[PDB]
Amino acid sequence: VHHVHPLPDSVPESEDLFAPPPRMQGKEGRPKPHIGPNYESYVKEWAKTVGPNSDEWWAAKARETLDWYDDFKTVRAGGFEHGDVQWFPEGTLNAAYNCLDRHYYKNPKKTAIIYEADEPSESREVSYEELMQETCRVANVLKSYGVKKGDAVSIYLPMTWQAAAAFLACARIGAIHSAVFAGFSAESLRDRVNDCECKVLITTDEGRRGGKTIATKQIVDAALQQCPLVENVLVLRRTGNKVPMTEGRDKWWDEECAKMPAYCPCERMASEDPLFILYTSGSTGKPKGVVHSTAGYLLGTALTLKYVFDAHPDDRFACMADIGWITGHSYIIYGPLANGITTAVFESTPVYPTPSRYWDFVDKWKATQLYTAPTAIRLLRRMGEDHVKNHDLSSLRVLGSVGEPINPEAWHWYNDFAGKNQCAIVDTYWMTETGSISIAPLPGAISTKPGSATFPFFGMDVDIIDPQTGQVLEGNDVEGVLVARRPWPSIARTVYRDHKRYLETYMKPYPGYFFFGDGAARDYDGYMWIKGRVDDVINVSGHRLSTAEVESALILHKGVAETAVVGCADDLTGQAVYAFVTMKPEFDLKATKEADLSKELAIQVRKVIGPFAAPKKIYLVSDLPKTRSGKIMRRVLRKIVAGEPQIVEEVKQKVT
Ligand SMILES: Nc1ncnc2c1ncn2[C@@H]1O[C@H](COP(=O)(O)OP(=O)(O)OP(=O)(O)O)[C@@H](O)[C@H]1O
Numbered sequence: 001v002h003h004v005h006p007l008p009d010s011v012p013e014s015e016d017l018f019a020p021p022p023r024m025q026g027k028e029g030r031p032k033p034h035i036g037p038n039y040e041s042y043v044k045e046w047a048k049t050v051g052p053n054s055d056e057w058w059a060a061k062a063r064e065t066l067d068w069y070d071d072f073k074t075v076r077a078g079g080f081e082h083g084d085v086q087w088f089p090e091g092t093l094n095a096a097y098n099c100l101d102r103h104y105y106k107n108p109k110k111t112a113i114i115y116e117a118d119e120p121s122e123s124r125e126v127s128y129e130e131l132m133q134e135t136c137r138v139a140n141v142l143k144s145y146g147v148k149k150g151d152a153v154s155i156y157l158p159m160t161w162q163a164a165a166a167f168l169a170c171a172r173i174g175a176i177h178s179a180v181f182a183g184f185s186a187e188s189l190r191d192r193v194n195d196c197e198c199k200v201l202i203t204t205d206e207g208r209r210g211g212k213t214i215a216t217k218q219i220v221d222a223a224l225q226q227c228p229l230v231e232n233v234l235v236l237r238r239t240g241n242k243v244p245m246t247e248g249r250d251k252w253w254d255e256e257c258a259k260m261p262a263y264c265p266c267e268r269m270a271s272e273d274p275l276f277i278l279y280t281s282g283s284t285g286k287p288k289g290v291v292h293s294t295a296g297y298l299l300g301t302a303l304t305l306k307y308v309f310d311a312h313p314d315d316r317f318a319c320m321a322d323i324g325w326i327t328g329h330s331y332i333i334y335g336p337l338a339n340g341i342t343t344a345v346f347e348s349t350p351v352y353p354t355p356s357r358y359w360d361f362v363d364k365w366k367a368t369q370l371y372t373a374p375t376a377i378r379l380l381r382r383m384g385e386d387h388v389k390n391h392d393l394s395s396l397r398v399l400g401s402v403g404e405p406i407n408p409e410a411w412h413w414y415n416d417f418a419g420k421n422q423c424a425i426v427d428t429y430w431m432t433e434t435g436s437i438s439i440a441p442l443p444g445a446i447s448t449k450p451g452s453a454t455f456p457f458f459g460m461d462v463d464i465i466d467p468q469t470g471q472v473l474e475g476n477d478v479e480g481v482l483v484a485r486r487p488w489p490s491i492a493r494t495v496y497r498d499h500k501r502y503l504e505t506y507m508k509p510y511p512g513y514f515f516f517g518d519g520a521a522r523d524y525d526g527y528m529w530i531k532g533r534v535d536d537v538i539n540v541s542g543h544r545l546s547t548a549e550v551e552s553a554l555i556l557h558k559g560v561a562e563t564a565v566v567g568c569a570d571d572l573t574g575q576a577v578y579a580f581v582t583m584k585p586e587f588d589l590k591a592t593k594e595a596d597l598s599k600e601l602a603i604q605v606r607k608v609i610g611p612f613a614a615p616k617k618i619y620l621v622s623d624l625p626k627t628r629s630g631k632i633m634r635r636v637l638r639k640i641v642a643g644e645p646q647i648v649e650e651v652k653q654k655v656t
């Protein structure tokens, strides 16, 4: 008799609640959790971070977490309506000083970065001394190019450890870095280079990902022909293969840095000075250049890492994402290094050289936390349990998931093999615009449900609004759109040179609130469930269906690897459901007739969700359209099913 149901799972609801395991109880010599041991301990602290008397907690956390050059006087000001959000405005600091120097001064030999190379034998540890010295050399090179405080600098680097040095070198001198996924086309790179109006670009000669070569310098050359403002290009010699170099414009990273000293002073940045620009992926439309300031963002990534992953000084955090993504910004570089711990820069893929790469990595360095996306979790689950069953992995305590709703079926595989039912699973929900994790379980306090992000993080006061009325739905067992009531420190301050798009997208749909764009429900116990994008909702005869419902129901069928449902106009039901299903490679499509597989899928969905939710048509594909981030581009499939990289050719053909 609950209007809000959990995501479909093979495990019954009465046996599907997972309390913090002994590794997250301070047992076996593991570190004691910062928040624990139950839900009330989370609320007792969270209540200090929201409301009209939360300034005391935030002012204390800001001064305790970051090193300041000048103290602040005001804690917060501004709001959503005009986009004038301010946090600690009178304070001065530097991100590079907090992520490097202050930890170098205490323990220079401590490992800052575990550089897991594409080839495993080429991996090595990078100390804080080496990362700070290389950062200061690059900062000295940029200053010799005439880069000033507030100038934009484009970054087009793959997942090599020097990418963090390029990030922090810009932050050290007050330049706004704008990282772009290594592998984006010359057209995509050009649009982001021209939009930020940078005069300097940093890239490599070539990149190496999963035994493949990214011709980064060749792509830069093609883009820069239509980028008339770039005057200086710094090229890192990653592979050593012959690439074109333009005289005067292009210089070698190693030859420039060798001329510069190994220390560079820190520019004293105001709290609201812009730290970086990051362009979104654009799963729903044209990407926007999200701008984050300094103090609020840095404090948010520092606190979230410490509490969402229960990080302790000697931990080795392993976020396997790419720094072209906000996950890499906040939980590879800024978050982990601000806390002064060891972070991982993973250059390869989850299946190179073999699908055991994640776990050969975990046992080699004894990683204490793992952070990845559901697309990689569903990829390793598809390759069999024989790449995971015979590893140790006991060094881990917390496993993370970010980017999309994680199906309970994929949640359990993560829980059973990567954690061996001894790790806590943090389903972390947030956006590029939020800066830091918005809704996630605190691993030493929250009992988890497969597919639920649980409860909002410190400083986040979220509510559910009925989109039909624009009113907040009070209580539990409610469903609607997710919004936030007040600003938080790490919130995006603007969209670069397009503040109107920033207010129209996030601040004007529901005035007084921040609009995430996601559908959400709060069950009877108060747990939040992110149902999917509001744009991706399908309305069949007045039944509003989310993507996470049907896809989680479809994956409950044997052999199903990954699915994606989109809507299309129907004359009887208003909209009809179309399913794109990917089976495991070992599945026999000849012994099992396809028409009977579709019928079994339609009954599997009807038995878990309802009669209305059965897909009207089901297409079998080899893969789905996905961004470099890993998100499924359901907007593309919807247009194909309506008539309007290489996987798009297989989808358009099979749709006719
Ligand atoms: N843990 C999660 N659970 C559910 N959805 C998630 C989770 N983490 C991320 N998401 C989804 O990802 C979105 C944020 O993704 P990101 O900021 O990388 O860009 P995007 O939404 O793909 O971009 P665009 O708005 O330009 O289309 C969220 O709004 C949500 O839809």
Ligand SMILES: [Mg+2]
Residues within 6 Å of the ligand: 284, 431, 517
């Ligand atoms: Mg979005």
